[PDB]
Design a protein around this ligand. Structure first.
Ligand SMILES: [Ca+2]
Ligand SMILES: [Ca+2]
Ligand SMILES: [Ca+2]
Ligand SMILES: [Ca+2]
Ligand SMILES: [Zn+2]
Length: 316
């Protein structure tokens, strides 16, 4: 809507207070005009019809329990936009400042979040397995990254290309978590997963096997469930990414870590310049090696580390 840009205040899912960009026109709306063509957050009102209604508030104060998921979806979409713009010089998910839209309170007791090809959608969780999904910055960044992938490499969501698609979302979801410096780690979804259990997460990049996911190509899932195991085999790539950044010895192969910034630069270049819709793991390795070569030279430590990491997880 057309109005006056202002700043409101509210509390997120985890009870933390934060300032959010809003727009005033009779009501205060969750519309951030400071980033690209805008960030819009909608209320799905427990229904499945999208996008729902643009979030309207009477006093620009969002401290009600019902407001929490909206506050975080709105705020974290902004942080993710900032990451891509400041670190990779990318304007929104399409590279041309496309408006970012999110709907919260989708369905009832919905333990999922997703990108539907046009916008992000967040369930409130059932209170046991998950609490409102927008409360996790790595979750929000994971979802917005699916949009970035769709506009760039276009990795088909099935088998190996789908596992790469998933890993890319976990990798950048984690890099955004570090960017925001919000209790960063190499775990996925820890802030909104199982509120009654501390110390766990949905997936682990540092040790995928902790939750039963493969950490080597020889242990890859070859079945038909989960679109060919896109959320399972992503562990193989997540482990490789973790090794490239942090280093370590995996299955007898030693990798010298080069840091998170370089990891991000290498994978962003691979994603936007070399990957295609049908790329498999072997092609991802080639794309990563070529990207590191473009940026640091063929005889660099960076290229050596990328090769070592993929060797460690069995991807040739
Ligand atoms: Ca209010
Ligand atoms: Ca964390
Ligand atoms: Ca995390
Ligand atoms: Ca937990
Ligand atoms: Zn995903």
């Amino acid at each position: 809507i057309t109005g006056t840009s202002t700043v409101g205040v509210g509390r997120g899912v985890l009870g933390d207070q934060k300032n959010i960009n809003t727009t005033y026109s009779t009501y205060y709306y969750l519309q951030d005009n400071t980033r690209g063509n805008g960030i819009f957050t909608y209320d799905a009102k427990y229904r499945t019809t999208l996008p729902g209604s643009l979030w309207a508030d009477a006093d620009n104060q969002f401290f009600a329990s019902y407001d929490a998921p909206a506050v975080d979806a709105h705020y974290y979409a902004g942080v993710t936009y900032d990451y891509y713009k400041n670190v990779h010089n990318r304007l929104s998910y399409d590279g041309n400042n496309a408006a970012i839209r999110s709907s919260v309170h989708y369905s009832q007791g919905y333990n999922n979040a997703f990108w539907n090809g046009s916008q992000m959608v967040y369930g409130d969780g059932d209170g046991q397995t998950f609490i409102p999904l927008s409360g996790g910055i790595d979750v929000v960044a994971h979802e917005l990254t699916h949009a970035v992938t769709d506009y760039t490499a276009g990795l088909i969501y099935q088998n190996e290309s789908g596992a790469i698609n998933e890993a890319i979302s976990d990798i950048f979801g984690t890099l955004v978590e570090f960017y925001a410096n919000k209790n960063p780690d190499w775990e996925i979804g820890e802030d909104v997963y199982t509120p009654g259990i501390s110390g766990d997460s949905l997936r682990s990049m540092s040790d995928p096997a902790k939750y039963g996911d493969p950490d080597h190509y020889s242990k890859r899932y070859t079945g038909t469930q989960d679109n060919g195991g896109v959320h399972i085999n992503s562990g193989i790539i997540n482990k490789a990414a973790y090794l490239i950044s942090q280093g370590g010895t995996h299955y007898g192969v030693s990798v010298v870590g080069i840091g998170r910034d370089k990891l991000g630069k290498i994978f962003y270049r691979a994603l936007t310049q070399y990957l295609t819709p049908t790329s498999n793991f072997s092609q991802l390795r080639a794309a990563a090696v070529q990207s590191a070569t473009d940026l640091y030279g063929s005889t660099s430590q960076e290229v050596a580390s990328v090769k070592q990491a993929f060797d460690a997880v069995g991807v040739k």
